[PDB]
C-alpha cells in the first residue's frame, strides 16, 4: 500500500507535467535569475506597461493596446485571457486524477466549477515573489506595486493573492507536492450540489494519504507540514469569496464588462 501511494504520486506529478507548461520549478529558475533565458520584461509603471504590452499573451479582434483607453481595463482583459487558458489546463489535469472520469458527470462538473479558481490561486503563488508576478509564461513580470496602483477596484484584485502567496511559498512546496495537493482540492466532498458524495470523499481520503506520505518523504524535518498545508485550503475559499465580491463591483460600476463566457459559466450560481 505504501508502494501504491507512491505510484499514485508519480502518476499525478507526470500528469501535472503534461498539463501545466510553466511549473514552479521553471518559474523559480526565472525568478532567481538561474535561467539562460534573457530576463522577463518588467512592467512596473504605466510607461513600461505600454512598452511591454505586446508581450502579454492576448488574441482578439484588435491588439490588447486598443482594447480600452484605460490601462487598468487592458490589464483586466489580459488577465481574463490567461484565466480561460488556466481553466483548460486544470481540466486536463483533473481528467488524469484516477477515479475522476468514472464519477457521475454531473459531479465532475460541480467539482471543476468550485475547485478551478482555488487551484488557480494555489498555482499563481508559484509565479510570485513578494515584489511581483510572472505573466505570459514567464516572458513578463508585473510588479506588485504597479498592480496595487491601478485605479479602484482594479488595484484591489492582486494584493490578497500576493499576501496569500508569500505565506504559502514559505511552505516551500515543490511541483511533486503541488500535484497531489491540487488533486485533494478538486475532490472536495463538501461542494454544494454534489449528487453522490461518497466515491468523491473516498478518492480524496486516498489522495490525502498519498499527500501525507509525499510530504513526509520529501520534507522530513518540516514538522507538521501536512497540517500547515491543510489550513491553506480554507484560505483559498476566502480568496475566492473576496475575488467574487470584487468582480461584482466591476459588473455593477464599470460599463460593459461582461466576462468571457467560460468564466461566466463558472461564476453563475457559485455559492
Amino acid at each position: 500500500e505504501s508502494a501504491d501511494l507512491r505510484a499514485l504520486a508519480k502518476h499525478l506529478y507526470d500528469s501535472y507535467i503534461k498539463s501545466f507548461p510553466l511549473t514552479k520549478a521553471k518559474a523559480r529558475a526565472i525568478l532567481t535569475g538561474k535561467t539562460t533565458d534573457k530576463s522577463p520584461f518588467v512592467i512596473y509603471d504605466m510607461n513600461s506597461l505600454m512598452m511591454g504590452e505586446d508581450k502579454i499573451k492576448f488574441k482578439h479582434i484588435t491588439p490588447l493596446q486598443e482594447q480600452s483607453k484605460e490601462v487598468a481595463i487592458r490589464i483586466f482583459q489580459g488577465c481574463q485571457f490567461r484565466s480561460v487558458e488556466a481553466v483548460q489546463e486544470i481540466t486536463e489535469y483533473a481528467k488524469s486524477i484516477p477515479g475522476f472520469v468514472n464519477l457521475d458527470l454531473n459531479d465532475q462538473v460541480t467539482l471543476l466549477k468550485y475547485g478551478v479558481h482555488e487551484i488557480i490561486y494555489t498555482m499563481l503563488a508559484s509565479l510570485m515573489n513578494k515584489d511581483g508576478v510572472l505573466i505570459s509564461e514567464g516572458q513578463g513580470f508585473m510588479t506588485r506595486e504597479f498592480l496595487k496602483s491601478l485605479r479602484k477596484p482594479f488595484g484591489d484584485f492582486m494584493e490578497p493573492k500576493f499576501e496569500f502567496a508569500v505565506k504559502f511559498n514559505a511552505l516551500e512546496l515543490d511541483d511533486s507536492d503541488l500535484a497531489i495537493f491540487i488533486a485533494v482540492i478538486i475532490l472536495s466532498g463538501d461542494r454544494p450540489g454534489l449528487l453522490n458524495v461518497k466515491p468523491i470523499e473516498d478518492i480524496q481520503d486516498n489522495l490525502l494519504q498519498a499527500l501525507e506520505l509525499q510530504l513526509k518523504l520529501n520534507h522530513p524535518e518540516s514538522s507538521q507540514l501536512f497540517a500547515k498545508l491543510l489550513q491553506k485550503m480554507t484560505d483559498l475559499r476566502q480568496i475566492v469569496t473576496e475575488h467574487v465580491q470584487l468582480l461584482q463591483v466591476i459588473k455593477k460600476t464599470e460599463t460593459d464588462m461582461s466576462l468571457h463566457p467560460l468564466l461566466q459559466e463558472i461564476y453563475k450560481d457559485l455559492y
Binding site: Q88, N106, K113, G193, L262, E265, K268, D269
Partner: peptide, 15 residues
C-alpha cells in the same frame, strides 16, 4: 449548477 447549466465545462470534460 449541473450538466444542465455548464455546456462549456462538459465540453472541456469529454474526451
Amino acid at each position: 449548477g449541473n450538466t444542465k447549466n455548464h455546456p462549456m465545462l462538459m465540453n472541456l470534460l469529454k474526451d
